[PDB]
Design a protein around this ligand. Structure first.
Ligand SMILES: *[C@@H]1O[C@H](CO)[C@@H](O)[C@H](O)[C@H]1NC(C)=O
Lengths: 49, 25, 25
């Protein structure tokens, strides 16, 4: 859990790399077909949910 | 360039290179 | 763009505005 929140998916495939969580969500959103802009703009709302 | 500069929590004022405009001129 | 208009089925008309032309003019 600690690795996932801080390093995203980097720890699984190699030495862990630190990335901001907000940024990690943007990357993850990209994977599902939703653009990065939606996450930052709705970051307050997404966090609440 | 989607969005306006009030909705992001983390931001910086770095200048965009904007390479395309000079060529058009 | 991908070739002639006629081959595609369900194609609808109207404008496809492009940024470069305005600056040039
Ligand atoms: C945390 O990050 C935000 C941007 O997301 C920034 O505005 C703020 O200054 C930072 N605060 C600390 C304590 O790092």
């Amino acid at each position: 859990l600690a690795g996932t929140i801080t390093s995203g998916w980097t720890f699984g495939a190699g030495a862990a790399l630190q990335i901001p969580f907000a940024m990690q969500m943007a990357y993850r959103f990209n994977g599902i077909g939703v653009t990065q802009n939606v996450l930052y703009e709705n970051q307050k709302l997404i966090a609440n949910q | 360039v989607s969005g306006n500069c009030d909705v992001v929590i983390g931001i910086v004022n770095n200048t965009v290179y904007d390479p395309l405009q000079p060529e058009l001129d």
